[PDB]
Amino acid sequence: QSMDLQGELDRFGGISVRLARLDALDRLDAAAFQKGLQAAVQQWRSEGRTAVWLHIPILQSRFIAPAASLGFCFHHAESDSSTLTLWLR
Amino acid sequence: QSMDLQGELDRFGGISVRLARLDALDRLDAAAFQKGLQAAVQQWRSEGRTAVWLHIPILQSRFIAPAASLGFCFHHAESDSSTLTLWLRE
Numbered sequence: 001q002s003m004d005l006q007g008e009l010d011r012f013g014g015i016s017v018r019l020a021r022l023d024a025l026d027r028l029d030a031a032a033f034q035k036g037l038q039a040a041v042q043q044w045r046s047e048g049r050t051a052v053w054l055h056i057p058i059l060q061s062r063f064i065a066p067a068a069s070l071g072f073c074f075h076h077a078e079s080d081s082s083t084l085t086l087w088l089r
Numbered sequence: 090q091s092m093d094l095q096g097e098l099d100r101f102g103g104i105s106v107r108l109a110r111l112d113a114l115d116r117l118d119a120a121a122f123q124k125g126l127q128a129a130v131q132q133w134r135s136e137g138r139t140a141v142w143l144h145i146p147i148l149q150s151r152f153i154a155p156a157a158s159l160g161f162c163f164h165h166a167e168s169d170s171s172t173l174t175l176w177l178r179e
Binding site: 060065069076078 | 147148149150151153154157158162163164165166167168169170171
């Protein structure tokens with residue numbers, strides 16, 4: 001198998017990933033994340049999820065560009081974190 | 090012989106740095122940017138500038154965490170770019 005992103009389903013059929021839960025110790029390599037996020041996104045499409053949300057603390061921003069390469073864009077940012085989203089259907 | 094960050098002086102005595110300008114070909118190493126940013130801020134602080142605003146296209150987000158390590162925080166982030174800031178007047 002492969003990387004468990006610990007996605008939380010919301011009431012609108014969407015799914016949320018927080019990097020503070022997934023990589024609590026800030027030890028996760030960006031390329032490995034890209035690989036896990038790519039595989040997760042493929043899975044979440046074929047189960048008819050509506051959207052994916054990625055919440056990324058500022059010091060963990062290494063995860064943004066690889067997410068972006070997969071379609072994610074900025075929704076908003078607080079001073080110390082950002083939230084990215086990918087619309088699915 | 091420090092790296093030129095190609096800062097743009099605004100009308101309020103602050104500096105804008107735009108990664109679309111500084112690294113148009115998307116070839117600049119994140120660590121090299123950090124070292125250059127650090128030095129640039131020393132210079133800007135010494136010359137009494139107001140603040141720094143960093144504009145960073147989304148695919149170039151490797152530059153954020155290093156900026157953050159020097160005290161920058163998000164100002165705004167939407168769509169395919171984000172903006173970071175560091176207030177210099179203490």
